[PDB]
C-alpha cells in the first residue's frame, strides 16, 4: 500500500517508535535514520505534535497512519484535522464539568477524539444518558459530539434538549483553552 513512500518517526518512547515503524514496513513503506538520509515523504508524529527538526514532506499523526491502513486508502492529510498536529493550549481544562458521548465516530478517529476530550477535562462515556444512575454507574451527559443530522443519539439529544455539536466544537475548544459557544457549532446549522 505504502510502496515507494518513506517515513521518519518522531517524539515517541522507544517501544512505540518501533511499533509504528513495523506497521509502516508491512504496508511496503521504508524507515529512515537520524542526522537522516534524504528528506522523507512523511514524518509521523504524536497527535499533539512535537519538534520537527528536519525539512520533511508532510507532518502527519499516527492517527493518520492507522486510518489509512484501516480503510486501505491513502487519505490526504488535509482532509481531516486529526491527520496533522492538533493545536492544544497546554495546561487548559475548559471542559472540566462536561460529559461527552460520541456518535458516528469509529476506530482511530474515536480514540483520538476521546484523548482530546479527557485532556481538556471532560469525562467520556460510551453511552449517552439523560439522568444519572448510581446503580448502573452512568452520569447524565452534557454534550453529544457527532458528524451528521441523524441516528439514535441525535434524536435523543433533541428529545432531552441537549446540545448536539460538530467535531469542530472540540478542536476549537482545545485550540483556545476556553469552552467554545456550542450555539455557533450546532449540528442543526451544518
Amino acid at each position: 500500500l505504502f510502496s515507494q513512500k518513506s517515513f521518519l518517526v518522531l517524539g515517541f518512547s522507544n517501544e512505540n517508535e518501533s511499533n509504528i515503524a513495523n506497521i509502516i514496513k508491512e504496508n511496503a513503506g521504508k524507515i529512515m535514520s537520524l542526522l537522516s538520509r534524504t528528506v522523507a515523504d512523511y514524518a509521523v508524529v504524536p497527535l499533539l505534535g512535537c519538534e520537527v527538526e528536519a525539512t520533511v514532506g508532510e507532518v502527519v499523526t499516527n492517527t493518520w497512519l492507522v486510518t489509512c491502513i484501516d480503510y486501505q486508502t491513502l487519505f490526504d492529510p488535509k482532509s481531516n484535522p486529526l491527520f496533522t498536529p492538533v493545536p492544544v493550549m497546554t495546561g487548559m481544562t475548559p471542559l472540566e464539568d462536561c460529559v461527552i458521548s460520541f456518535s458516528q465516530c469509529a476506530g482511530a478517529e474515536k480514540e483520538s477524539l476521546t484523548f482530546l476530550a479527557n485532556l481538556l477535562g471532560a469525562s467520556v462515556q460510551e453511552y449517552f444518558v439523560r439522568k444519572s444512575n448510581a446503580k448502573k454507574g452512568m452520569f447524565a451527559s452534557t454534550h453529544l459530539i457527532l458528524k451528521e443530522r441523524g441516528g439514535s443519539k441525535y434524536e435523543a439529544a433533541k428529545k432531552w434538549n441537549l446540545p448536539a455539536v460538530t467535531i469542530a466544537w472540540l478542536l476549537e475548544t482545545a485550540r483556545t483553552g476556553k469552552r467554545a459557544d456550542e450555539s455557533h457549532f450546532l449540528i442543526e446549522n451544518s
Binding site: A106, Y127, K136, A156
Partner: peptide, 9 residues
Amino acid sequence: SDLVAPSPD
C-alpha cells in the same frame, strides 16, 4: 428508556 445505547462496531 432514559439511556441510549452504543455505536456497536
